[PDB]
Amino acid sequence: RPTFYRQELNKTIWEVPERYQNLSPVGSGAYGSVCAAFDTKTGHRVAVKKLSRPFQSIIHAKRTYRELRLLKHMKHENVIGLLDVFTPARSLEEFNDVYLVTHLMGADLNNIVQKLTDDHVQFLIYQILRGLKYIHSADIIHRDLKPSNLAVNEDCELKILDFGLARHTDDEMTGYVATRWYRAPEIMLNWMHYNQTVDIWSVGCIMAELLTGRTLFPGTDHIDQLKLILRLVGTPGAELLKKISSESARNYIQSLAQMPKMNFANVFIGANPLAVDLLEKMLVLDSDKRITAAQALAHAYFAQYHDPDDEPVADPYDQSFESRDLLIDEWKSLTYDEVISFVPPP
Ligand SMILES: NC(=O)c1ccc2c(c1)CCCO2
Ligand SMILES: [Cl-]
Ligand SMILES: [Cl-]
Ligand SMILES: [Cl-]
Ligand SMILES: [Cl-]
Ligand SMILES: [Mg+2]
């Protein structure tokens, strides 16, 4: 066990191993209570997150377990990974705080998206799809890909963030808000049981915005946003209508006058024809028919970066706990086991 020291940060007393020095608050609070630090063991600048009230309720205790399980599993160059996890507690009975350590990531894709060449768009979207192929191979659905969840460095290298945090609330999704502009229509409107294909819609929205400098579907509310979507991709045909299992939602969408899909070469004026082709394959209303991440990596738009021997998949991820009902102290004991069993990367 390392020696720990105490310091007052972010309105509480932080207690951390001596290896972490020069702690200072960082960020806007989006991912929790976070401080930057220098890790003297590795030489890395790191982010240290101290969870607030991780076990106050069943929902909070299970969410804490979920975040730790997901972060411990992710081992890929284009996905956030866990450098360390620690608690000052010496036993389960005194366990009450969890600290998570990752690489410090200053800028996100907003902070860049600058004059982006087509070569830049190729490299950025390639890296998102490489990470997504890995995530999806573990049967994990991201659900919230958007520019603020994509960390990028000075060499254009990218990592995907946002695993195991609280589900977004109805109020967070209301109005003229970026948290809804990237969502697939079937999840925005609860049309049907959704699956991993929601994430490919989000990638299409991001790619369009890198190419034009403008939000693709900046709706002022759910209904305005649906109208923007259907104007570009067309109103649904009978085949998709059958798959909308919500009778109410199916009835509303039939109240709208029918519209054909637009010509994407006339929407994305001047863009690489291979980029136009890929956008047409991602932004398909029927999710069954969208291109997958593994298929998209082989598209000719990425010919300069694609290497099928360097696009790895994930070890299997058991998420049977998601359907399990346990008491607070049982989720807490599972979390403690995962803290003490952590093995750091090479
Ligand atoms: N769960 C996440 O996706 C996530 C994102 C950022 C982040 C952390 C965790 C912990 C260290 C601070 O920064
Ligand atoms: Cl990482
Ligand atoms: Cl503790
Ligand atoms: Cl964003
Ligand atoms: Cl969500
Ligand atoms: Mg989110």
DSSP label at 261?
Answer: P
Structural Rg of the chain based on CA atoms: 22
State the resolution, in angstroms. Answer: 1.5
Contact 99, 49 (CB under 8 A): yes
CB neighbours (10 Å) of residue 8?
Answer: 8
Evaluate the CA torsion angle 82, 88, 94, 99 in order and state its sign.
negative
How far apart are the C-alpha atoms of 6 and 304, rounded to whole Å?
50
Q: 3-state class of 47 per DSSP?
A: strand
- Cα separation, 296 vs 284, in Å, equals 14
58 HSE (CA, 13 A, CB side): 5
Estimate the crossing angle of helix 58-73 against helix 328-340, to 10 degrees: 20
The residue among 188, 184, 190, 155 whose CA lies nearest residue 174 is 188
The continuous run of DSSP H or E covering 14 comes out as: strand 12-17
User: 3-state DSSP call for residue 24?
Assistant: strand
Q: What is the DSSP string of 266-312?
A: HHSTT--HHHHHHHHHHS-SSGGGSPPHHHHHTSGGGTTT--TTS--
C-alpha–C-alpha distance, residues 341 and 223, integer Å: 48
Q: Which atom of ligand 1 is nearest to the CA of 70?
A: 1
Give me the residues paired with residue 34 across strands: 49
State the Cα–Cα distance between residues 211 and 118, nearest whole angstrom.
7
Q: What is the DSSP string of 164-217?
A: SPPPPPTGGGSSS-HHHHTS-HHHHTT-S---TTHHHHHHHHHHHHHHHSS-S-
Would you say 311 and 133 are in contact if contact means Cβ atoms under 8 Å apart?
yes
For the CA of 15, the nearest ligand: 3
Residue with the two structure tokens 């190729």: 122
Question: For residue 190, how far is its CA from the centre of ligand 1 (angstroms)?
Answer: 28
162 carries an active-site annotation: yes
The ligand that comes nearest to the alpha carbon of residue 89 is 3
Give the method used.
X-ray
| Ligand 1 atom with the shortest distance to the CA of 34 | 12
Rounded Cα–Cα distance for residues 212 and 21 (Å): 42
User: How many Å lie between the centroid of ligand 1 and the Cα of residue 123?
Assistant: 24
Q: How many CB atoms lie within 10 A of CB 18?
A: 11
- Residue owning tokens 């720990």: 4
Out of 44, 161, 167, give the residue to mutate to test ligand 1, the one with the largest number of ligand atoms within 8 Å of its CB. 161
* Cβ neighbourhood burial of 255 (10 Å; 0-12, 13-18, 19+): exposed
SS3 50: strand
Pick the ligand that lies closest to the CA of residue 146: 4
Q: Are 69 and 164 in contact (CB under 8 A)?
A: yes
Amino acid at 238: A
Q: Which long-range contacts (CB under 8 A, 24 or more apart) does 233-240 make?
A: 233/261, 233/262, 233/283, 233/284, 233/285, 234/259, 234/260, 234/261, 234/262, 234/285, 235/259, 236/285, 236/286, 239/286, 240/285, 240/286
* Contact call for residues 46 and 101 (beta carbons, < 8 A): yes
Who lines ligand 1 at CB under 6 A?
31, 34, 47, 49, 67, 71, 80, 100, 102, 161-165
Burial of 5 (0-12, 13-18, 19+ CB in 10 A): middle
Q: Which of 46, 102, 167 to mutate to test the pocket of ligand 1 (most atoms within 8 A of CB)?
A: 102
DSSP 96-115: ---EEEEE----BHHHH---
198-212 and 273-282 helices, crossing angle to 10° = 150
Surrounding residues of ion ligand 6, Cβ less than 5 A: 144, 162
d(CA 320, CA 62): 13
Q: Which of 118, 162, 224, 277 is catalytic?
A: 162
Q: How far is the CA of 161 from the centre of ligand 2 (A)?
A: 9
End-to-end CA distance of the chain: 19
Cβ-contact 211, 113 below 8 angstroms: no
The residue to mutate among 46, 100, 101, 142, having the most atoms of ligand 1 within 8 angstroms of its beta carbon, is 100
The residue with tokens 């990367």 is 345
From the list 69, 2, 92, the residue with the least C-alpha distance to 41 is 2
Contact 279, 207 (CB under 8 A): yes
